[PDB]
Every structure is written in C-alpha cells, then in structure tokens.
Design an enzyme around this catalytic site. Sequence first.
Site, PDB file in Angstrom:
ATOM      1  N   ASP A 315       1.000  -1.236   0.054  1.00  0.00           N
ATOM      2  CA  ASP A 315       0.173  -0.005  -0.109  1.00  0.00           C
ATOM      3  C   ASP A 315       0.771   1.158   0.184  1.00  0.00           C
ATOM      4  O   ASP A 315       1.932   1.424   0.877  1.00  0.00           O
ATOM      5  CB  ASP A 315      -0.903  -0.028   1.272  1.00  0.00           C
ATOM      6  CG  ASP A 315      -2.158   0.944   1.176  1.00  0.00           C
ATOM      7  OD1 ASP A 315      -2.984   0.920   0.320  1.00  0.00           O
ATOM      8  OD2 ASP A 315      -2.074   1.800   1.891  1.00  0.00           O
ATOM      9  N   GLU A 362       1.576  -0.652  -5.096  1.00  0.00           N
ATOM     10  CA  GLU A 362       0.686   0.171  -5.183  1.00  0.00           C
ATOM     11  C   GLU A 362       1.209   1.699  -5.562  1.00  0.00           C
ATOM     12  O   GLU A 362       1.351   2.303  -4.747  1.00  0.00           O
ATOM     13  CB  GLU A 362      -0.388   0.156  -4.099  1.00  0.00           C
ATOM     14  CG  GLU A 362      -1.884   0.773  -4.458  1.00  0.00           C
ATOM     15  CD  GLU A 362      -1.702   2.380  -3.847  1.00  0.00           C
ATOM     16  OE1 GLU A 362      -2.047   2.203  -2.464  1.00  0.00           O
ATOM     17  OE2 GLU A 362      -1.563   3.279  -4.313  1.00  0.00           O
ATOM     18  N   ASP A 415     -11.026   1.990  -3.131  1.00  0.00           N
ATOM     19  CA  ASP A 415     -11.080   3.359  -2.936  1.00  0.00           C
ATOM     20  C   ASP A 415     -12.037   4.108  -4.052  1.00  0.00           C
ATOM     21  O   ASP A 415     -12.121   5.126  -3.824  1.00  0.00           O
ATOM     22  CB  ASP A 415      -9.582   4.059  -2.895  1.00  0.00           C
ATOM     23  CG  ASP A 415      -8.625   3.741  -1.911  1.00  0.00           C
ATOM     24  OD1 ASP A 415      -9.240   3.767  -0.838  1.00  0.00           O
ATOM     25  OD2 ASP A 415      -7.555   3.377  -2.083  1.00  0.00           O
TER      26      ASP A 415
HETATM   27  C1  LIG Z   1      -6.330   6.791  -1.078  1.00  0.00           C
HETATM   28  C2  LIG Z   1      -5.127   6.743  -2.091  1.00  0.00           C
HETATM   29  O1  LIG Z   1      -4.669   8.140  -2.220  1.00  0.00           O
HETATM   30  C3  LIG Z   1      -3.536   8.214  -2.585  1.00  0.00           C
HETATM   31  O2  LIG Z   1      -3.617   8.320  -4.124  1.00  0.00           O
HETATM   32  C4  LIG Z   1      -4.791   8.600  -4.777  1.00  0.00           C
HETATM   33  C5  LIG Z   1      -4.514  10.020  -5.302  1.00  0.00           C
HETATM   34  O3  LIG Z   1      -4.451  11.051  -3.994  1.00  0.00           O
HETATM   35  C6  LIG Z   1      -5.402  10.752  -6.080  1.00  0.00           C
HETATM   36  O4  LIG Z   1      -5.083  12.045  -6.678  1.00  0.00           O
HETATM   37  C7  LIG Z   1      -5.753   9.653  -7.301  1.00  0.00           C
HETATM   38  O5  LIG Z   1      -4.647   9.691  -8.019  1.00  0.00           O
HETATM   39  C8  LIG Z   1      -4.788   9.423  -9.638  1.00  0.00           C
HETATM   40  C9  LIG Z   1      -5.100  10.794 -10.404  1.00  0.00           C
HETATM   41  O6  LIG Z   1      -6.645  11.169  -9.885  1.00  0.00           O
HETATM   42  C10 LIG Z   1      -5.143  10.952 -11.636  1.00  0.00           C
HETATM   43  O7  LIG Z   1      -5.486  11.958 -12.439  1.00  0.00           O
HETATM   44  C11 LIG Z   1      -3.807  10.217 -12.296  1.00  0.00           C
HETATM   45  O8  LIG Z   1      -3.871  10.119 -13.613  1.00  0.00           O
HETATM   46  O9  LIG Z   1      -3.797   8.936 -11.517  1.00  0.00           O
HETATM   47  C12 LIG Z   1      -3.623   8.933 -10.257  1.00  0.00           C
HETATM   48  C13 LIG Z   1      -3.281   7.737  -9.845  1.00  0.00           C
HETATM   49  O10 LIG Z   1      -1.721   7.369  -9.883  1.00  0.00           O
HETATM   50  O11 LIG Z   1      -6.186   8.467  -6.761  1.00  0.00           O
HETATM   51  C14 LIG Z   1      -4.979   7.901  -5.977  1.00  0.00           C
HETATM   52  C15 LIG Z   1      -5.450   6.348  -5.755  1.00  0.00           C
HETATM   53  O12 LIG Z   1      -6.636   6.340  -4.965  1.00  0.00           O
HETATM   54  C16 LIG Z   1      -2.239   7.474  -2.440  1.00  0.00           C
HETATM   55  O13 LIG Z   1      -1.105   7.579  -3.064  1.00  0.00           O
HETATM   56  C17 LIG Z   1      -2.728   6.016  -2.355  1.00  0.00           C
HETATM   57  O14 LIG Z   1      -1.602   5.285  -1.841  1.00  0.00           O
HETATM   58  C18 LIG Z   1      -3.738   5.815  -1.367  1.00  0.00           C
HETATM   59  N1  LIG Z   1      -4.426   4.424  -1.003  1.00  0.00           N
HETATM   60  C19 LIG Z   1      -4.170   3.524  -0.003  1.00  0.00           C
HETATM   61  C20 LIG Z   1      -3.659   4.165   1.369  1.00  0.00           C
HETATM   62  C21 LIG Z   1      -4.267   4.419   2.160  1.00  0.00           C
HETATM   63  C22 LIG Z   1      -3.583   4.781   3.573  1.00  0.00           C
HETATM   64  O15 LIG Z   1      -4.177   4.405   4.961  1.00  0.00           O
HETATM   65  C23 LIG Z   1      -5.779   4.037   2.645  1.00  0.00           C
HETATM   66  O16 LIG Z   1      -6.502   5.085   3.073  1.00  0.00           O
HETATM   67  C24 LIG Z   1      -7.679   4.449   3.755  1.00  0.00           C
HETATM   68  O17 LIG Z   1      -7.587   4.142   5.185  1.00  0.00           O
HETATM   69  C25 LIG Z   1      -7.542   5.465   5.889  1.00  0.00           C
HETATM   70  C26 LIG Z   1      -7.378   5.157   7.220  1.00  0.00           C
HETATM   71  O18 LIG Z   1      -8.604   4.530   7.966  1.00  0.00           O
HETATM   72  C27 LIG Z   1      -8.890   6.425   5.743  1.00  0.00           C
HETATM   73  O19 LIG Z   1      -8.822   7.694   6.309  1.00  0.00           O
HETATM   74  C28 LIG Z   1      -9.891   7.845   7.422  1.00  0.00           C
HETATM   75  O20 LIG Z   1      -9.813   7.325   8.671  1.00  0.00           O
HETATM   76  C29 LIG Z   1      -8.559   7.947   9.451  1.00  0.00           C
HETATM   77  C30 LIG Z   1      -8.525   7.195  10.608  1.00  0.00           C
HETATM   78  C31 LIG Z   1      -9.132   9.201   9.692  1.00  0.00           C
HETATM   79  N2  LIG Z   1      -8.314  10.247  10.628  1.00  0.00           N
HETATM   80  C32 LIG Z   1      -8.835  10.899  11.762  1.00  0.00           C
HETATM   81  C33 LIG Z   1      -8.209  10.138  12.847  1.00  0.00           C
HETATM   82  C34 LIG Z   1      -8.332  10.874  14.006  1.00  0.00           C
HETATM   83  C35 LIG Z   1      -7.646  10.092  15.403  1.00  0.00           C
HETATM   84  O21 LIG Z   1      -6.333  10.323  15.540  1.00  0.00           O
HETATM   85  C36 LIG Z   1      -8.781  12.268  14.241  1.00  0.00           C
HETATM   86  O22 LIG Z   1      -8.214  12.844  15.215  1.00  0.00           O
HETATM   87  C37 LIG Z   1      -8.789  13.124  13.040  1.00  0.00           C
HETATM   88  O23 LIG Z   1      -9.896  13.524  12.823  1.00  0.00           O
HETATM   89  C38 LIG Z   1      -8.370  12.347  11.674  1.00  0.00           C
HETATM   90  O24 LIG Z   1      -6.885  12.406  11.592  1.00  0.00           O
HETATM   91  C39 LIG Z   1      -9.148  10.119   8.333  1.00  0.00           C
HETATM   92  O25 LIG Z   1      -9.993  11.381   8.362  1.00  0.00           O
HETATM   93  C40 LIG Z   1     -10.194   9.297   7.377  1.00  0.00           C
HETATM   94  O26 LIG Z   1     -10.163   9.911   6.282  1.00  0.00           O
HETATM   95  C41 LIG Z   1      -8.856   6.871   4.095  1.00  0.00           C
HETATM   96  O27 LIG Z   1     -10.015   7.754   4.103  1.00  0.00           O
HETATM   97  C42 LIG Z   1      -8.960   5.377   3.365  1.00  0.00           C
HETATM   98  O28 LIG Z   1      -8.945   6.126   2.229  1.00  0.00           O
HETATM   99  C43 LIG Z   1      -6.410   3.597   1.021  1.00  0.00           C
HETATM  100  O29 LIG Z   1      -7.678   2.801   1.504  1.00  0.00           O
HETATM  101  C44 LIG Z   1      -5.403   2.735   0.372  1.00  0.00           C
HETATM  102  O30 LIG Z   1      -5.938   1.990  -0.528  1.00  0.00           O
END
Ligand SMILES: C[C@H]1O[C@H](O[C@H]2[C@H](O)[C@@H](O)[C@@H](O[C@H]3[C@H](O)[C@@H](O)[C@H](O)O[C@@H]3CO)O[C@@H]2CO)[C@H](O)[C@@H](O)[C@@H]1N[C@H]1C=C(CO)[C@@H](O[C@H]2O[C@H](CO)[C@@H](O[C@H]3O[C@H](C)[C@@H](N[C@H]4C=C(CO)[C@@H](O)[C@H](O)[C@H]4O)[C@H](O)[C@H]3O)[C@H](O)[C@H]2O)[C@H](O)[C@H]1O
Lengths: 518, 518
Positions: A315, A362, A415
């Site tokens: 990941d 990934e 995602d």
């Molecule tokens: C998701 C993905 O993101 C990145 O890549 C994306 C990229 O950002 C986009 O732009 C796009 O890119 C494309 C682009 O659009 C096109 O134009 C281009 O041509 O191609 C590109 C692709 O090359 O898409 C990509 C891919 O989707 C990263 O690079 C990628 O690696 C990521 N995917 C991974 C990684 C993770 C990491 O954890 C997973 O994330 C998931 O899980 C987390 C954790 O649960 C979740 O977060 C939620 O939960 C958190 C706990 C919360 N945090 C709160 C916690 C607290 C306690 O301390 C609070 O105090 C406080 O309020 C917060 O800090 C978060 O808020 C909540 O969101 C993620 O949501 C979830 O996605 C991915 O699943 C995994 O596949």
Amino acid sequence: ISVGEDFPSEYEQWLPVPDPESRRRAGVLLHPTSFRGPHGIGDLGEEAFRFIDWLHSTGCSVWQVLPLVPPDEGGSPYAGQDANCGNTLLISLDELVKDGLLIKDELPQPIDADSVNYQTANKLKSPLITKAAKRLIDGNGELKSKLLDFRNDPSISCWLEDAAYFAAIDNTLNAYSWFEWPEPLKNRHLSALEAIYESQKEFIDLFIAKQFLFQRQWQKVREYARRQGVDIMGDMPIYVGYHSADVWANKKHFLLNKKGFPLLVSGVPPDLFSETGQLWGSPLYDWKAMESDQYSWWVNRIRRAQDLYDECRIDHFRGFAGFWAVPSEAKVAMVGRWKVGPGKSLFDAISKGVGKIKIIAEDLGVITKDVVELRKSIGAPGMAVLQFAFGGGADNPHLPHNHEVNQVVYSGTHDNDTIRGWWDTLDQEEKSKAMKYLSIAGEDDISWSVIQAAFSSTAQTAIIPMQDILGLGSSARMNTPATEVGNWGWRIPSSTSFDNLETESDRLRDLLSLYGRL
Amino acid sequence: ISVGEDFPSEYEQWLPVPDPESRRRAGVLLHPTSFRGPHGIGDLGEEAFRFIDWLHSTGCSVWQVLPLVPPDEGGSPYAGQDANCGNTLLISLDELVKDGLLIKDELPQPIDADSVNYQTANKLKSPLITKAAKRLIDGNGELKSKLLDFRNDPSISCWLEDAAYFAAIDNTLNAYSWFEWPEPLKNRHLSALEAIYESQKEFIDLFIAKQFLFQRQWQKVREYARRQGVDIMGDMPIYVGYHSADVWANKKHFLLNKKGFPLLVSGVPPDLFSETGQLWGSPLYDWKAMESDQYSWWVNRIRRAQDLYDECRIDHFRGFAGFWAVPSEAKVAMVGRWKVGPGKSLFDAISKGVGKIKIIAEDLGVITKDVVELRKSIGAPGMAVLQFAFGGGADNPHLPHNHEVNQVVYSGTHDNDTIRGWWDTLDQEEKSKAMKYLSIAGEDDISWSVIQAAFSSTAQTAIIPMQDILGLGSSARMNTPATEVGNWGWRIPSSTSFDNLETESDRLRDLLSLYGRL
Ligand SMILES: C[C@H]1O[C@H](O[C@H]2[C@H](O)[C@@H](O)[C@@H](O[C@H]3[C@H](O)[C@@H](O)[C@H](O)O[C@@H]3CO)O[C@@H]2CO)[C@H](O)[C@@H](O)[C@@H]1N[C@H]1C=C(CO)[C@@H](O[C@H]2O[C@H](CO)[C@@H](O[C@H]3O[C@H](C)[C@@H](N[C@H]4C=C(CO)[C@@H](O)[C@H](O)[C@H]4O)[C@H](O)[C@H]3O)[C@H](O)[C@H]2O)[C@H](O)[C@H]1O
Ligand SMILES: C[C@H]1O[C@H](O[C@H]2[C@H](O)[C@@H](O)[C@@H](O[C@H]3[C@H](O)[C@@H](O)[C@H](O)O[C@@H]3CO)O[C@@H]2CO)[C@H](O)[C@@H](O)[C@@H]1N[C@H]1C=C(CO)[C@@H](O[C@H]2O[C@H](CO)[C@@H](O[C@H]3O[C@H](C)[C@@H](N[C@H]4C=C(CO)[C@@H](O)[C@H](O)[C@H]4O)[C@H](O)[C@H]3O)[C@H](O)[C@H]2O)[C@H](O)[C@H]1O
C-alpha cells in the site's frame, strides 16, 4: 554446430517455450467481511470455500483481499489496532463446531445485517469465540499441542507477546490511548509487565488462543485456494495506528516526542478526493532509527505476510521514496512537507532476511522520478486503474495502449466507486472520451465493457472487484477516501449465492479465454 | 538528501519525462513504382513530394519502401540484379528537365499503365535517361563536378566500379548469365577487364552517371521527407540474384562449385503460401568465408543503406540464425535442409564498422529458439502482422494482447493480400474469431477496423499499406509469394490524387491522436 553446417532433423520443432512466470491471469478483489452469513459479518467458513469454487469455475487464479488486521472502530484495515494480528471477528463459528470447541445448540440466532456493523458483530460473536478459546486452553489433546507450537514459534512470539500484553493493559485501564497510561506501563518496565501477567494471565492466554484460531482458519482457506489453483494476494498497509502494540513496543522507531506523542502524522496533499488533502492521522516511521537494526520490524511484517499470502500488495508504495508529513496538531493535511523515504535500502534488507518475494507496488497518486526508479530497481509490477484513464490526453498511463506487461490492471480499487456508480457521476467530456476507447452495448452493462478492456490489456494480471462482476451501483462502494462514516461495510446481498452466478462465471470464462488469461 | 530529511519545495513537480526514443508513431508502406504518372511507372518526381505532404498531414512520421535495387525482369526487388545500385527506372524525367539535361519537347507521349509493366517502362524511359546521362558527362559545369565527387567517394567505388564493369561485359556478350562467359571475363583477369574498359568506356561512364542521377533524386526526396518530419524505412533483401556483380565479383563468398555454378539455393520449407515450399532460387552465402574478411561485403551493404535511409528492415531476419538450403537442380524447395547462420558475429562486425544502426527484424515464418535469442541479443524490434492473428488460440503472438513495445505492427505486408481481399477469402471459423476481437461497423470498412486495431497496439510503430488506407480489394495485392507472374505491379489509380484524400487523412489523424501516435 559450426557456421554453415547442417542442423539436426528436429530443428523446426526447437520452438520457444513460454516462461511460466510470464503467465497471464485474472482475479477478483473481495474482502472476507463481505461474505453473507447470519452473524452480522462474513467469516472464514463455508462462504469462503464456495467463493473459491466459484472463482475456480470462472478461470480466475487470483483472489485479492484487503489487510486482515483488526480494523479501527469505523471498520478500516488501513489504521489497524495491530500490524501482524488477525481480525478475530473473521473467525467462523460453524468451523469451531467442526473443531469440537463449540456445540451446535450454542450457535446464536441469525441477524439481518445487509451491511457490516462491527459493533453488532462484536457483541454477537465475541462471547462464543472466547468460550471456544477457553475450551481450547483447558484441553490436553492435539489442538492444545498445536497451540503450544504456535506460541513458541520464534517468529510468532516476536509480535504476538507484545500484542497480548498491550491488549491486556488496555483491558485493565480506562485511558483513551497509551499516551495516558502510567509511566511504568507506558514505558514497559519489567516489574509492571510482570504484574500485568499475574493479574491478566487468563485474558492473555485467551488472546493468544484467538490468534491461533484465526491462524488456523486462514491457513485452511489458503490451502483450499491452493488446491483449486488460486493464489491469494494480500495487502500490506503502509501505516499502523497510534494505539497499537507496534507503536508502543517500538517507540524509538516512530517520530514521537520524549513523552510518546506524535510529532508528525501521515496523509497526502490536496488531491482528487479532498481539496484539503487526506489527513490519515497515523504516526510516521523514524526511518534512520529503523535502518539501524536493519529494519527488523519491517522485515518481520513481510515474513508474517509470506506466511499468510502468496503475493502481497504494498500500500502507498510511493511513501517509501517520499512521504508526506503533517504537524500532529493540524486539522487538515494541506499544510505539510515531503520527506525522504528509505528507498532501496529497505528492500535489500527484506531480500537479505526473507528471501524471494512476490510484491505488487501500489504506485498510485503523485508519482515523482524517484518512485518510478525505486519500483523498477526492485522489479515490482506497478498498477493501472481504468477509472483514471479518461482525464488528460493520450499519454495517460492508465489507457490500455500505455500499459506494460509487468503490471496489474484494475477496473477499480476499493478506494474508487464501482464502475456503474463511476459512469453515473462521470463528467461529459470524460464520458464521450471513454465511449471512443471502450466497447459499449447497453449502459447497464458498462461494467462488462470495462472488464473487457481490463482483460484485453498486455498487463500480466487483471483484477476486478466483486461489485463490478455483480454490476452494482454506488451504494456498494467499499470506501470513499477522506470520509469517516459509512465505509468497509459492503456485503454480498443475502439473496445472491455462488450457485446462482453461472451466467457471470461463463461470461467471464469467455473473456479470459479470448484474452489468453485462462 | 539523507533519509528522513525534507525534500525541496518543487518535489511534486519532479515528474518523470517521456524518453524521445520511446515515441509512438505510425507509417505508410508504399513503393515509389506505385505512384501515378504518364511514363508507365512511378518515379522520384512530383508524386513523391505530394505523398510526403499528404503523409505529413495525416500525422504519420514513417514512410516504408521496398528495396530500391534494380529489380528482376518480373519486377521483384528481392532477387535484384545488383545489391547496392538504384533502380534507374525510378528516375523522374520531368526532374531531368529541371536539371537542364532534357528539354520538354523530348519528353515522350503519355501511356495508360494502370499497373506497371517493367519492359514497357524500360523501352519508354531508358533512351531518354541515357540521353540525359550523355549530356551530363559531356558538360563541364557544377553538375559534372558533383558527378566526379560521387565517383571517387571511396565508399561508392567499392561497389559502383564492379557493377559498371559487370553491366559493360553483359552488354558486350550474348550469354544468358555470367556462368557462360569466357574464363577471362568470368574470373576477372586484369587484362580482360582492361580491354573491357577501352572498348566500353562510354557505356561505363553512362552507367555511373545514371547511378549519380538516381542518388541525386533520392537524396532530394529524403531531404524533403526530413523537412516534413518523415523518416524513411528501407528494406534490405537477404539474398541477391545469381546474375549480378555481387556474386561475380565475390565468388568465393557464395556457395558455388569450381566452375561458378550454385551448389545450393535459397527458399523456405512447406508453409502457408505453398505445399511444396517457396523455392526462391538465389545463390547462398558461404558464411565461414565471409567471416574471414570480417563480412566486409555485408558491412558495405549496411553502410550504403545508412546513406539512403533512416532505418532499415532486414528481410528474412531468421536466415541469419538458420537458413534453408535446397539442391540447385531441384524443382521444389520441400527437399532441403536447415543450415547454421552467422548469428551475432555478423552484427558485431556491422557495429564495429558502421556504428549505431536502426534495424527492424522481419522475424516472420518458422521461429526457432535461436532466432528469438539473436533478435533480442542485438535489441532489434520484431514484427506483428494482424492478418496472421486469428489462426490458433489466444497465445498467437500477432494478437494485440500479445504485442510487445519494441515491435512493429502491420495490418499486412506486401506479401499478404489487402485487408478487404483477406476478409473476402477468410475461413468462417477465422472470421467469427476476428469479429470478437475487432471493432467492426460495415464490412466495407473492415480496413479501418484492422487499422484501428493496429494503432491501439502497445507496439511502438504501426505501419499500414497504402492499399488499405484506400480500402482496395485483392486486385491491388502487391505480391503473392510462390508465384512468378503478376506481382510488383500495383499503382495508385490514376484518378486518386493526394489532394482528394482529406477524409482519409482526417480519419487517420483522429486515430493517431486517440492512440497517442501523433
Ligand atoms: C487513497 C489513495 O490516495 C493516494 O492516491 C490517490 C491520489 O491521491 C488521487 O489523486 C488519485 O490519483 C490519480 C489521479 O486522480 C489521476 O489524475 C492520475 O492520472 O492517476 C492517479 C493515480 O496514479 O487516486 C490515487 C489512488 O486512489 C495514495 O497515493 C494512495 O496510496 C492511497 N490509497 C491507499 C492508502 C491508504 C492509507 O491508509 C488507505 O487509506 C484509507 O484508510 C484511511 C485510514 O482509515 C482512511 O482515513 C480515514 O480514517 C482515518 C483514521 C481518519 N483520521 C482521523 C483520525 C483521528 C484520530 O487520531 C482524528 O483525530 C482526526 O480527525 C483524523 O486524523 C481520516 O480522516 C479518514 O479519512 C482513508 O480515508 C482511506 O482511504 C487507502 O484505502 C489505500 O488504498
Ligand atoms: C515470404 C516470407 O516467407 C517466409 O515467412 C512466411 C511464412 O512462410 C508463412 O508460413 C507465414 O507465416 C506465418 C504463419 O502462417 C502463421 O500461422 C504464424 O502465426 O505466423 C507466421 C509468421 O511468423 O507468413 C510468413 C511471412 O509472409 C519467410 O520467413 C519470410 O522472411 C518471407 N518474406 C520476405 C523474403 C523474401 C525473399 O525472396 C521475399 O520473397 C519474394 O521475392 C522472391 C524473389 O523474386 C519471390 O520469388 C519468386 O521469384 C523467384 C525469382 C522465383 N524463382 C525461380 C527461379 C528459377 C531459376 O533460378 C527457377 O528455375 C525456379 O522455378 C524458381 O526458383 C520464385 O519461384 C518466385 O516465387 C517470392 O515469391 C516473393 O515472396 C518476400 O517478399 C519478403 O517479404
């Protein structure tokens, strides 16, 4: 034979033989919590074996799961409560009946849970899992002997003991996290840990027994997959949660202050999913520290994964080249910095310690020069997602004409929306661009058109989410990034069984045949 | 920057830049004899420049020609009368008027030749080409000075002198071939060659002047192509004919007996085109002999080709790994055997002598392990032909899902039927197989469906015959292998001009854009 001379009479039949490591193949992405069943959540029982059988009949040879770690309280495998442990709520109760640990009468009344509620599932299943573990530690038979073998396995105990102690301390205390624990528990003083063992001995042995039970049911699922010619591709989440034995038992290997609070946390800058970026909140790795006992904690993760899977998705692979650091107090990810990752140095240590290894990078998101080079310098295939293919022009790397062989192509990931849902929301310039590239009969079956485009790729592996094989809408989306409620809950509809998907199976088999993926 | 440290503020924009050597592109296969014009045959005059302009407007950047050697009497460039000379019948007469060597009044009456007749063209054009060369050698101006430069160019004379002497001797004698020449001409005695020079001095200087004229018109076509961003891909026939200066002046480097007769001749075993195989009839190379002055004759071929072309197709590339030898007396190729070719040893000598060269390996036919390895050990791209894609199953290497990047994809070669004609004769199992892979609107436009499938390929270069851009039937087939009459004669219909192909141009441009080949 010297230049000019005659060849032997079997020269015409000295034909080149296809490398078995180059074999084209297809797969399905389906997390085990999505299986049907009466206990509020899917498990490693009958539905797992039926799915393998169905998958075998399609001609697919890969089953991709999400991380099998105990998830956070919203259901997320990517900020788990431990790195190496298994989600004990995936334990099949019906299987514990076959093992002698439960009797049929004890199995609870069914519940309707058309989506997973992790708390409903916990209240229903945990009493019975504990009862079963209690019977296991009480016994003196062959199963007890297998538990003792599991415990003193040197490469299990180097993570399992810390995780039990941690779970035990957390059971003793009212604290929100380990940051608030008293200094002697917080910093793992010998006598304080000794006292915990004495007062929480049974809980500890029960926790270890539940991990044995998960281990056993998973290894049986994996053996049955191997028997039917199906490899299982796991998932290695890059980050683990703050409240875990991993962070607690290896403080110096994370970026925390003197008192144990995180200096910086994880996320990504402003992107497709959020105007402010995605603030994941996880603590971050002190890479120079880790480098100094040879990344032994990372090397143990990969060793554990080898035991659970044939192959593994890494990941947020880009994070090993460069990672985004946000100040721990921040309410958004958009204020932050890129920092230099460990690079090849990590992967040489994994090679040196674990050996040869089937890794899928990934490599989605912001892809800089150093990411492309790291991926290529370890030989790992990258990814193409067709849902990102129709922004920009013809150089977009997700378009089929730009795929490479050493690559995995997805219709979408967990995602992304489903295909149907994605097509429903699609901007009109992106839609007519897609119509020129794809073969579309009815829009209802846009799923099958995308699946067709994925299979026709030169990429060696093609993975499809089960939602798209079923042609489901956005209500079946597994996760929306940068949201906190309503994720990780999708289940196969209770009325769809693996015996009523012959048409889907055939239609798939036809496509794999056509594109040489059988 | 060390592990853990911050990156500079322009890290997000350190994006990977596409290699210019990886540029995707498209092209058209069209031999200059197929151009329209009033002189029975196409030439290097105005039609050549109009085609380049049209080709430029489509977005194509490659023009592929057949070998430009003087053909055999049935029109074939692949058993030419010389290896390095140019086909002087391609000289534009209208261009010689611009150069001052002819006056307009002398240009002959037009003839209707909707296919080329090489003998009709020879009768009509050769008197005027000789008249023009006579005026050139008589003059003292700038053009004469350019002829003198051409002659004493060390790398022209090492082939041009032998070819003039040969043509001169053949003009003196009634013999069918040089086998029947008297011993002193046959074996190139100094005094006998001296005598030829004295009695055939004018003929010799005329022949050399005609080669200068060809060279001049060709280099002007190539400079105009370069100006419009079009590379020219030539073709290196593997074998040359028995009656040539090449065989005659290098007897010891071919497989001939003591008296000069061929022991073995070229061909291929029973294949798609003939139940008895194709007996080409050419003499064969004594490879161990050639290895002994460093393949200097082969190294001069490639040097000549560098001067004429940007890039070069190596005909029957497999022949350099292994070649099929048939007894010279045989009436069919099916009695014969495979012999060991020179392998990498040839290509190292070409590197050492000529430097870096752009080579395309025509690796069609029976492909053994040693062929695949030779191609890969020199880095040359291979070929895919879509017309061979629909026999067999999904592992057929000509199917788009099996293409590689370092490869050229053709709808068809000059050896295949046109697409229309191919589709018209196609077996019914092969046809419904093709319908599943291809995107077909009307069957009339099956050409455009196959062109589409070629452009959508991951192969770096896509080449289409001009016949298929025009949607022509089997009457427009250029060559049928294992036949002696009715080949090499196709010409663009006299009523189609490059100013009335806007729709074709646009439709192509749309496809290149869509598949990133502009
Ligand atoms: C998701 C993905 O993101 C990145 O890549 C994306 C990229 O950002 C986009 O732009 C796009 O890119 C494309 C682009 O659009 C096109 O134009 C281009 O041509 O191609 C590109 C692709 O090359 O898409 C990509 C891919 O989707 C990263 O690079 C990628 O690696 C990521 N995917 C991974 C990684 C993770 C990491 O954890 C997973 O994330 C998931 O899980 C987390 C954790 O649960 C979740 O977060 C939620 O939960 C958190 C706990 C919360 N945090 C709160 C916690 C607290 C306690 O301390 C609070 O105090 C406080 O309020 C917060 O800090 C978060 O808020 C909540 O969101 C993620 O949501 C979830 O996605 C991915 O699943 C995994 O596949
Ligand atoms: C043509 C091509 O053949 C080989 O590859 C074929 C292969 O054999 C086919 O089976 C098929 O292969 C497919 C297969 O079907 C699929 O199932 C599979 O999946 O894919 C494969 C492809 O990988 O197609 C391929 C490709 O077409 C070779 O391996 C290939 O390299 C060859 N193409 C080249 C080579 C030459 C060399 O000559 C060209 O040949 C052409 O020119 C010659 C010369 O004129 C011509 O021959 C005619 O003229 C001769 C002068 C005459 N000779 C007589 C002379 C005499 C006195 O000396 C007489 O006494 C005596 O009767 C004769 O010897 C010949 O008879 C006459 O035929 C060829 O016909 C002509 O094709 C090719 O143009 C060039 O592209």
